Design an enzyme around this catalytic site. Structure first.
Site, PDB file in Angstrom:
ATOM      1  N   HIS A  62       0.794  -1.125  -0.141  1.00 18.63           N
ATOM      2  CA  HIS A  62      -0.088   0.007  -0.078  1.00 18.63           C
ATOM      3  C   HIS A  62       0.898   1.195  -0.088  1.00 18.63           C
ATOM      4  O   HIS A  62       0.546   2.361  -0.242  1.00 18.63           O
ATOM      5  CB  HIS A  62      -0.942   0.092   1.198  1.00 18.63           C
ATOM      6  CG  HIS A  62      -0.628  -0.462   2.651  1.00 18.63           C
ATOM      7  ND1 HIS A  62      -0.020   0.457   3.470  1.00 18.63           N
ATOM      8  CD2 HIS A  62      -0.139  -1.679   2.704  1.00 18.63           C
ATOM      9  CE1 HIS A  62       0.258  -0.287   4.652  1.00 18.63           C
ATOM     10  NE2 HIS A  62       0.128  -1.469   4.184  1.00 18.63           N
ATOM     11  N   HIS A  92       6.698   6.762   5.722  1.00 20.92           N
ATOM     12  CA  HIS A  92       6.279   6.569   4.588  1.00 20.92           C
ATOM     13  C   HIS A  92       5.644   7.828   4.055  1.00 20.92           C
ATOM     14  O   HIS A  92       5.194   8.814   4.496  1.00 20.92           O
ATOM     15  CB  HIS A  92       5.055   5.166   4.548  1.00 20.92           C
ATOM     16  CG  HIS A  92       4.037   5.721   5.608  1.00 20.92           C
ATOM     17  ND1 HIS A  92       4.218   5.353   6.811  1.00 20.92           N
ATOM     18  CD2 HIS A  92       2.833   6.320   5.186  1.00 20.92           C
ATOM     19  CE1 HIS A  92       3.060   5.485   7.571  1.00 20.92           C
ATOM     20  NE2 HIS A  92       2.157   6.185   6.593  1.00 20.92           N
ATOM     21  N   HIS A  94       2.084   9.231   1.358  1.00 13.63           N
ATOM     22  CA  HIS A  94       0.695   9.041   0.622  1.00 13.63           C
ATOM     23  C   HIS A  94       0.660   9.932  -0.497  1.00 13.63           C
ATOM     24  O   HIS A  94       1.041  10.953  -0.306  1.00 13.63           O
ATOM     25  CB  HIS A  94      -0.537   9.148   1.453  1.00 13.63           C
ATOM     26  CG  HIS A  94      -0.530   8.467   2.616  1.00 13.63           C
ATOM     27  ND1 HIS A  94      -1.331   7.224   2.844  1.00 13.63           N
ATOM     28  CD2 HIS A  94      -0.055   8.674   3.919  1.00 13.63           C
ATOM     29  CE1 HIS A  94      -0.915   6.787   4.101  1.00 13.63           C
ATOM     30  NE2 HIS A  94      -0.139   7.605   4.918  1.00 13.63           N
ATOM     31  N   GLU A 104      -3.365  13.307   2.898  1.00 14.79           N
ATOM     32  CA  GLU A 104      -4.569  12.783   3.658  1.00 14.79           C
ATOM     33  C   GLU A 104      -5.245  13.850   4.379  1.00 14.79           C
ATOM     34  O   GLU A 104      -6.349  14.280   4.188  1.00 14.79           O
ATOM     35  CB  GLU A 104      -4.015  11.730   4.541  1.00 14.79           C
ATOM     36  CG  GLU A 104      -3.584  10.552   3.838  1.00 14.79           C
ATOM     37  CD  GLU A 104      -3.577   9.169   4.570  1.00 14.79           C
ATOM     38  OE1 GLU A 104      -2.914   9.293   5.748  1.00 14.79           O
ATOM     39  OE2 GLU A 104      -4.149   8.272   4.111  1.00 14.79           O
ATOM     40  N   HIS A 117       4.519  10.966   6.440  1.00 13.53           N
ATOM     41  CA  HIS A 117       4.439  10.417   7.956  1.00 13.53           C
ATOM     42  C   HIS A 117       5.417   9.721   8.429  1.00 13.53           C
ATOM     43  O   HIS A 117       6.044   8.857   8.054  1.00 13.53           O
ATOM     44  CB  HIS A 117       3.150   9.397   7.765  1.00 13.53           C
ATOM     45  CG  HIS A 117       1.945  10.176   7.529  1.00 13.53           C
ATOM     46  ND1 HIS A 117       0.741   9.310   6.969  1.00 13.53           N
ATOM     47  CD2 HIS A 117       1.632  11.486   7.538  1.00 13.53           C
ATOM     48  CE1 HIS A 117      -0.429  10.165   6.924  1.00 13.53           C
ATOM     49  NE2 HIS A 117      -0.015  11.347   7.098  1.00 13.53           N
ATOM     50  N   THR A 196      -4.154   5.622   9.682  1.00  8.07           N
ATOM     51  CA  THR A 196      -4.941   5.994   8.611  1.00  8.07           C
ATOM     52  C   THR A 196      -5.227   4.957   7.660  1.00  8.07           C
ATOM     53  O   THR A 196      -5.866   4.983   6.594  1.00  8.07           O
ATOM     54  CB  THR A 196      -4.575   7.234   7.762  1.00  8.07           C
ATOM     55  OG1 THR A 196      -3.301   6.988   6.972  1.00  8.07           O
ATOM     56  CG2 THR A 196      -4.593   8.647   8.634  1.00  8.07           C
TER      57      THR A 196
HETATM   58 ZN   LIG Z   1       0.465   7.129   6.633  1.00  6.89          ZN
END
Ligand SMILES: [Zn+2]
EC number: 4.2.1.1
Length: 258
Positions: A62, A92, A94, A104, A117, A196
């Protein structure tokens, strides 16, 4: 039929396997800058990353995680709204399929191209797996990315993504200094929230920095070449791996700055 970010298994479906998805302190949220409360008792953040030891970079299907040695107090976060010492375990990102989406958290409904993050755990609980079961177990530092000038400190991450293109691949990734990813100012918003991604546990003190970092279009483009799938499976590009904003409910966002 595992969870993911597609039409039939994306965030709108997660509550069927993880009922805490409709909980009272879920993340991310929209940060309304005019109703955030300045709290003069908030302390400045203390980021001590000079002895960080990165170990590996991994495509987990992911996102990609850069993992750190968290067996000693080498890269720690203190101060701010926190009590005690939190150890860095991984970071990581997003990101989106387009520059106009990917983060996010949002700021006055504005979306950024990506969100970094940095995940830390409270050392009083002894290990990460115990910390996630506690309301004060994790502290996540969130940094927005906007597209503009390149970020030199990110390029070592970008250049090794070819080696971890598909799910489950990992590569040695030593001597990476996360200080190269921080903005100039450490002014922040903070609120109590959740992971999340599943299991969406409500164990996170969120610390979201006000100042974004700039990355180049070419840098974020290489994020979008990663794959959700494993090798030898049909190719699905790893894009739009972000959860939409959740209701604030009975929470107040506090700001360290006026
Ligand atoms: Zn994250």
């Amino acid at each position: 039929h595992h969870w993911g970010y597609g039409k039939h298994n994306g965030p709108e479906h997660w509550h069927k396997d993880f009922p805490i998805a409709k909980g009272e302190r879920q993340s991310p949220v929209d940060i309304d800058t005019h109703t955030a409360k300045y709290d003069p008792s908030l302390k400045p953040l203390s980021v001590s990353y000079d002895q960080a030891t990165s170990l590996r970079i991994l495509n987990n299907g992911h996102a990609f995680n850069v993992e750190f040695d968290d067996s000693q107090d080498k890269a720690v976060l203190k101060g701010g709204p926190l009590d005690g010492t939190y150890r860095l375990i991984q970071f990581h990102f997003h990101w989106g399929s387009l520059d106009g989406q990917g983060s996010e958290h949002t700021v006055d409904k504005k979306k950024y191209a990506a969100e970094l993050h940095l995940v830390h755990w409270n050392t009083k609980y002894g290990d990460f797996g115990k910390a996630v079961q506690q309301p004060d177990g994790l502290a996540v530092l969130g940094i927005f990315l906007k597209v503009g000038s390149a970020k030199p400190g990110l390029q070592k991450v970008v250049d090794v993504l070819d080696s971890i293109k598909t799910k489950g691949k990992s590569a040695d990734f030593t001597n990476f200094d996360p200080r190269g990813l921080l903005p100039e100012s450490l002014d922040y918003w903070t609120y109590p929230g959740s992971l999340t991604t599943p299991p969406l546990l409500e164990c996170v003190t969120w610390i979201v920095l006000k100042e974004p970092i700039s990355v180049s279009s070419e840098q974020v483009l290489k994020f979008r070449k990663l794959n959700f799938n494993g090798e030898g499976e049909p190719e699905e590009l790893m894009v739009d791996n972000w959860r939409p904003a959740q209701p604030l409910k009975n929470r107040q966002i506090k700001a360290s700055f006026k």
